[PDB]
């Protein structure tokens, strides 16, 4: 039997109860600064704390507008709009929009999924309000920042067997769009994930304005002045696994890495990365995805990427994260450009590590001269110049199968060895490595 409520005030009591079936009636509901306080509706954060288990919540035709000023009403603390702590809950069809662009007093998360066996389905989320907004991570995304930040991220999947399905997540905020943290068997399925871009040249045009970047003479956290010629996302990862983190299940606090992530039939647009799971453990499986205009396509470290696609307008479609990457099996289509090329990385793929099986397919005939498949070598990546992030660049590749069903040139560096290469044409293959095999295939 479904209980229908017609106010946020009447909804909140159900979030503390088990085994309920609740529907918030179709309509527009607004949360403003005046709704936060001791005798106001929201006296604590997280605003919507789903503590019960085995419950279902129907938000069909519900527009929930949350004024970004609310992110400053809880002191110097984290503000989570929605957090699920219970188990076996289903939340469906909510349209949640941050109103305005006010930055959090500290930081914010739109949705946090702890517990186990929860599902959020059919949500439409628009994320706003963060600082600094306009630079990506150039001036710091963690500690020791050049410009101190007030990040605001989208969906954080933790817990066990938690599931995000058929959601639209649009970010205009400096933070991750979808991320996994201490999550065991998280699944992201059928989602559309979208940020927006800004060139480093446009940022550099702030010279002499007195902007925050102008004040630090554009000195990045990578140890050098912000280079021209790159296209950056104003968001962080599209789908990204955290290195560490904490989750809560049945009152147990758990610190662990993410393990066994699955990503299916997702479209990720204009984020710092399409799908990055290198920090996760266990079985990694990514299938049927489409990455458009991201700074990086797929970087899962190890596992399977299959029937996936990405364009190469702003960065490579594929990157091995470390030289210890092992067993990365990928079948990636290099898609037609979704916009004008602006790729300062000078690469469509950077390959290293050992025992990979990599296939690239494309119908592109006009190859920009700076674009190439690199096995080993010195990647001109925005964040790995001049010794920055040194473990993520200049590493060897050994015992790799590379099936190049593209017109893209291939550059095998001297650090490359035992690379088995097949390609449509071999004339545009430069081999400076050891015991590499290069063979021509017809089309």
Residue numbers in the entry: 1 to 443
Provide the authors' original text about this structure:
FdlA from Flavobacterium sp. SA-0082 is an endo-type fucoidan-degrading enzyme that cleaves the sulfated fuco-glucuronomannan (SFGM) through a lytic mechanism. Our structural, biochemical, and enzymological analyses strongly suggest that FdlA-NTD utilizes catalytic residues different from other β-helix polysaccharide lyases, potentially representing a novel polysaccharide lyase family.
We first measured the enzymatic activity of 12 mutants and found that eight of them (D137A, K141A, H176A, F179A, E236A, R240A, Y242A, and Y242F) almost completely abolished their activities, H279A mutant retained approximately 65% of the activity compared with WT, while mutations of Asn243, Arg272, and Tyr322 to Ala only negligibly affect their activities. However, we identified changes around the potential active site in several inactive mutants, implying the potential roles of these residues in catalysis. Therefore, mutation of Phe179 and His176 possibly results in the dysfunction of Tyr242 and hence loss of the catalytic activity of FdlA-NTD.
